[PDB]
């Protein structure tokens, strides 16, 4: 039941949300958990942040070692596989689930993945991990459409903030947003930007 | 090994051991960081007894609570790493970097043997900057910044006092706030003033007495 | 009881429960019969299938032209023991050009199996083996058990309901050891013996596996069409 208890530990970590658009992938977290592994890829986690440090450092070291062994940088698939492989090897085990998102080298398709204490990983168009992941995932299922995907960075950030605000108490002080864009154009939304979008959605939530 | 429902036994019990240890207090100012400890016996040698506040490098100090025996191991680990960083890079460690290392060493003993029953406040200034720094750590291996924080057996009480007690302006207000937190919770107090340019000094018993008598006169006034 | 769970614990009566349960492991397995004459040694095995759609387990392992063995119990332990026996015989051939005598092989397997029954952390091999071979001293047949005991025999049967086969072999001992100059009658006696251990089942071209080694016979395994003449 060791991995079951590790998953119970995951159930008490802060929630993290990811959304993939046509040209953007955006990660949001309740009040930076989203941390850069390589110039083009990031990792987000929920659970024991103490145990997350080893996973983050191993992932970073592996990304640089791959860039050193092969001329090409790591793909998001490769980094997700390595995170799963390490997270298995300690089965006390790490009580942390993770998301991995970014772009492949000289790529144009945003990637997003989720990984589990079981070592299971799978690609997701939008996914949540943490304490209230079930409610946020249910909310996403009725607001995201595979046949009508987000088109622009604005849509991606709006959808992420709206999903987090479902349970978050006060967005301006209780959520954070990072925007990952092709060719290591990763950026983190500042306070004024996030507040702009939050107020834009607030003006509509009050109306129904 | 994890407990059912996601707890971790030994870390919880190390937290209990920290909670039963003597207190350590900290206050960060606009221009300085002040750490305070209550010494909490008539034959114990005061002249040479070590202060709870310890230097980890020329610019950063560590204060601890809980098991005294484990504090030595943690402090020597931190000192060795701080000097190794200067071996590899010219620049001395940042305060954030040092608190991160001590969090890692605390964590590694929880998954590897028992956890250290120690929690710490870390204060200092970056090697060529001037902003105040104050950080905290606990056995789980997690850290956070603070404006003023405390650890130990009086924490449940003095913590709300410090919340009640816009950062303070000048070192006189910093030491005043520290000593007033120590006295308001109930003169045998260590006070260490950390200033940029590696000026780390502990206030003498007579300086403590001056501040304490001034604050008791203020308390008499109401 | 409290002495069952560890291999390094004697019971108050001096028994090693953890090894007797390994013997029960062979008692779980299907029957395999072995017998010898002065010139030929024969193995007969009743294979098992997990399902009607599934093929049968190979219960005869060929070491080389002069030696081979059959299994009863946990197959993976048989893999390990057989590859160790292969290593020993191969080492003997490389270092001495010498055919590893069957008794030497039997005692090497005994020594290896004994180690698991004395040191903590190791598990007794839950498989028993019948080993046949032909060397400068004639045909041989050995019985190996988890406890490490190795016994040289005229004939024997290990596995479920092997007691009837052993009774038949004991009854006919004075006969089949006389068989000379031909392997056919020895294999016939072997299949007659194994037939004693069948309930709600019968020998068939798919159940049965036969092997033989001798003066004029390098170790050969008969199966499928080849065994039809003996069933």
């Amino acid at each position: 039941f060791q991995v079951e208890y590790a998953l119970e530990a995951v159930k008490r970590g802060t929630c993290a949300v990811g959304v993939k658009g046509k040209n953007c992938v955006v990660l949001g977290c309740e009040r930076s958990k989203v941390s850069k592994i390589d110039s083009h890829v990031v990792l987000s986690f929920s659970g024991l942040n103490a145990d997350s440090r080893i996973l983050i450092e191993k992932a970073r070291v592996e990304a640089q070692s791959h860039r050193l062994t092969l001329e090409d940088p790591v793909t998001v698939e490769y980094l997700t596989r390595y995170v799963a492989g390490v997270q298995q090897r300690y089965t006390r085990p790490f009580g942390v689930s993770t998301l991995i998102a970014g772009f492949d080298p000289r790529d144009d398709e945003p990637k997003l993945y989720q990984t589990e204490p079981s070592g299971i990983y799978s690609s997701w168009s939008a996914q949540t991990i943490g304490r209230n992941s079930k409610t946020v995932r249910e909310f996403l299922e009725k607001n995201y459409d595979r046949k009508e995907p987000p088109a622009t960075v604005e849509e991606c950030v709006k959808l992420t903030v709206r999903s987090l605000l479902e349970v978050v108490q006060t967005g301006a002080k209780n959520i954070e947003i990072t925007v990952v864009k092709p060719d290591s154009d990763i950026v983190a939304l500042s306070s004024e930007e996030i507040n702009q979008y939050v107020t834009q959605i607030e003006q509509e939530k009050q109306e129904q | 090994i994890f407990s059912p429902d996601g707890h971790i036994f030994q870390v919880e019990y190390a937290l209990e051991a920290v909670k039963r240890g003597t207190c350590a207090v900290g206050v960060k100012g606009k221009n300085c960081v002040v750490l305070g400890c209550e010494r909490r016996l008539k034959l114990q040698d005061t002249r040479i007894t070590p202060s709870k506040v310890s230097k980890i490098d020329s610019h950063v100090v560590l204060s601890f609570s809980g098991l005294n025996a484990d504090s030595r191991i943690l402090i020597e680990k931190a000192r060795v790493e701080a000097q190794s960083h200067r071996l590899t890079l010219e620049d001395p460690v940042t305060v954030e970097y040092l608190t991160r290392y001590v969090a890692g060493v605390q964590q590694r003993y929880t998954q590897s043997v028992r956890p250290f029953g120690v929690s710490t406040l870390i204060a200092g200034f970056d090697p060529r900057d001037d902003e105040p720094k104050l950080y905290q750590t606990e056995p789980s291996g997690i850290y956070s910044s603070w404006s003023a924080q405390t650890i130990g057996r009086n924490s449940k009480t003095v913590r709300e006092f410090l919340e009640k007690n816009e950062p303070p302006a000048t070192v006189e207000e910093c030491v005043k706030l520290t000593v007033r937190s120590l006295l308001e919770v109930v003169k045998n107090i260590e006070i260490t003033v950390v200033k940029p340019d590696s000026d780390i000094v502990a206030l003498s018993s007579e300086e403590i007495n001056q501040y304490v008598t001034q604050i008791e006169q203020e308390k008499q006034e109401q | 009881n409290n002495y069952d769970g560890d291999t390094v614990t004697f019971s108050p009566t001096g028994r090693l429960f953890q090894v007797e349960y390994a013997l029960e492991a062979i008692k779980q397995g299907s029957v395999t019969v072995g017998l010898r004459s002065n010139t030929h040694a024969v193995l007969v095995a009743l294979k098992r299938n997990a399902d009607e759609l599934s093929s049968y387990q190979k219960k005869i392992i060929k070491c080389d032209e002069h030696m081979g063995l059959s299994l009863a119990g946990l197959a993976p332990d048989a893999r390990v023991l057989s590859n160790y026996l292969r290593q020993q015989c191969n080492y003997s051939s490389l270092v001495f050009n010498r055919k590893l005598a069957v008794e030497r092989a039997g005692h090497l397997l005994c020594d290896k199996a004994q180690k698991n029954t004395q040191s903590y952390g190791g598990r007794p091999y839950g498989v028993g083996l019948l080993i046949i071979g032909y060397d400068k001293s004639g045909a041989h047949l050995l019985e190996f058990q988890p406890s490490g005991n190795v016994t040289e025999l005229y004939g024997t049967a290990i596995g479920a309901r092997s007691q009837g086969a052993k009774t038949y072999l004991e009854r006919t001992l004075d006969t089949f050891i006389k068989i000379d100059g031909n392997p056919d009658e020895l294999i016939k006696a072997g299949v007659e013996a194994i037939s004693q251990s069948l309930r709600d089942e019968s020998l068939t071209v798919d159940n049965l596996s036969i092997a033989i080694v001798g003066k004029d016979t390098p170790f050969t395994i008969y199966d499928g069409e080849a065994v039809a003449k003996y069933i």
Binding site: - | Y13, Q44, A69, D70, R72, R114 | -
Partner: protein, 241 residues
């Protein structure tokens, strides 16, 4: 050795109990020296009690006494000597100060408190020593590796009574001979059996002893500051007592 639900280290308290079962040992700091004292029990009248000394030299400036399990003290002492030489004197060409050697001994005992397969040491030490910089020192080191400096202290079965007596007697202006007098009185009050120069033993961290240096002609070298008081030296003081 693991935390109990109450936050206490489980087996350390048992080591402290074993120490409490040990015979009384004392330490007293004078302004110009340090005294460490202890009564030595005997297994039988036939045993040569003079064979074993509970007080032992760690460095020519540092000495140690204990209460608790004697064999543990002996192995901890030769470990302490080994570390004091290999780890400090081999490098710096000088013996470690009382603080540093006390820290290393505390580390030795703490490793057992933080490692599996080994029980903690069942001895509490009083390590008296002297330094050119820190001056005279007296440290009590517990089974847990926690060590604290004391002006005067007592350990063993007589701990509380001896401590309450020292609290009365000790003052900031004791000379070494006054400290020896107080130690003799305190340990006599705690010994239930016979009390004479052979059952008690004393050592002092005092002024230089060139008579014990064993060689002459080097003005710089000073000689041991630690020295045991012989049976006759103690008998002289008990007679003058």
């Amino acid at each position: 050795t693991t935390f109990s639900p109450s936050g206490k280290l489980g087996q350390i308290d048992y080591a402290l109990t074993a120490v409490k079962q040990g015979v009384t040992s004392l330490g007293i700091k004078a302004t110009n020296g340090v005294v460490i004292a202890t009564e030595k029990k005997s297994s039988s009248p036939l045993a040569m009690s003079e064979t074993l000394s509970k007080v032992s030299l760690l460095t020519p400036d540092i000495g140690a006494v204990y209460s608790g399990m004697g064999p543990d003290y002996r192995v901890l002492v030769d470990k302490s000597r080994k570390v004091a030489h290999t780890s400090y004197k081999r490098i710096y060409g000088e013996y470690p100060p009382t603080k540093l050697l006390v820290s290393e001994v505390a580390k030795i005992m703490q490793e057992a408190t933080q490692s599996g397969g080994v029980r903690p040491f069942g001895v509490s030490l009083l390590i008296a020593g002297h330094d050119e910089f820190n001056g005279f020192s007296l440290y009590q080191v517990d089974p847990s590796g926690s060590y604290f400096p004391w002006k005067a202290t007592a350990i063993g079965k007589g701990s509380v009574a001896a401590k309450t007596f020292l609290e009365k007697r000790w003052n900031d202006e004791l000379e070494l001979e006054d400290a020896i007098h107080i130690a003799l009185l305190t340990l006599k009050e705690s010994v239930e059996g016979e009390f004479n120069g052979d059952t008690i033993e004393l050592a002092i961290i005092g002024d230089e002893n060139p008579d014990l240096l064993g060689y002459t002609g080097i003005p710089t070298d000073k000689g041991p500051r630690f020295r045991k008081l012989t049976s006759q030296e103690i008998n002289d003081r008990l007679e003058a007592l």
